[PDB]
Short mmCIF file of C-alpha atoms and ligand atoms in Angstrom, two decimals:
data_model
loop_
_atom_site.label_atom_id
_atom_site.label_comp_id
_atom_site.label_asym_id
_atom_site.label_seq_id
_atom_site.Cartn_x
_atom_site.Cartn_y
_atom_site.Cartn_z
CA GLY A 1 -17.01 41.09 -75.53
CA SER A 2 -14.38 43.87 -75.68
CA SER A 3 -12.94 44.10 -72.11
CA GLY A 4 -9.27 44.21 -73.28
CA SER A 5 -8.61 40.80 -72.94
CA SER A 6 -4.96 41.05 -73.36
CA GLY A 7 -1.27 41.07 -71.04
CA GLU A 8 -2.27 37.13 -69.24
CA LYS A 9 -0.12 37.95 -66.17
CA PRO A 10 1.30 34.48 -64.12
CA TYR A 11 -0.09 33.07 -61.14
CA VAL A 12 -1.73 35.95 -59.49
CA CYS A 13 -2.70 35.70 -55.50
CA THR A 14 -6.70 36.15 -55.18
CA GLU A 15 -6.45 37.16 -51.81
CA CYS A 16 -3.81 40.26 -51.91
CA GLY A 17 -2.79 40.85 -54.92
CA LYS A 18 0.68 39.66 -56.27
CA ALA A 19 1.80 38.06 -59.45
CA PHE A 20 4.76 35.58 -59.32
CA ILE A 21 6.04 34.18 -62.75
CA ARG A 22 7.45 31.98 -60.89
CA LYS A 23 5.78 28.01 -60.00
CA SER A 24 7.10 28.42 -56.31
CA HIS A 25 6.81 31.78 -54.39
CA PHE A 26 2.91 31.11 -55.73
CA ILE A 27 2.66 28.01 -53.85
CA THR A 28 4.52 29.05 -50.91
CA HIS A 29 2.77 31.79 -50.56
CA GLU A 30 -0.53 29.96 -50.06
CA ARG A 31 0.49 28.68 -46.65
CA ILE A 32 1.02 32.06 -45.00
CA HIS A 33 -2.42 32.69 -45.91
CA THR A 34 -4.21 29.28 -45.72
CA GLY A 35 -5.03 29.46 -41.63
CA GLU A 36 -5.93 26.06 -41.79
CA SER A 37 -4.22 23.07 -44.15
CA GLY A 38 -3.78 19.41 -43.25
CA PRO A 39 -3.95 15.63 -44.33
CA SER A 40 -7.32 14.88 -42.25
CA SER A 41 -8.96 18.20 -44.40
CA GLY A 42 -8.63 18.31 -48.43
ZN1 ZN B 1 -1.79 36.56 -51.10
#
């Protein structure tokens, strides 16, 4: 209802908490996080 809803921030990591105005440092940040990730999976 009235919980602010203002000040929309860029890509904010939902694991540690970090905003990334750019669309590069964020995508790359997911690597160090995602312990497992390959072609066979996903
Ligand atoms: Zn993070």
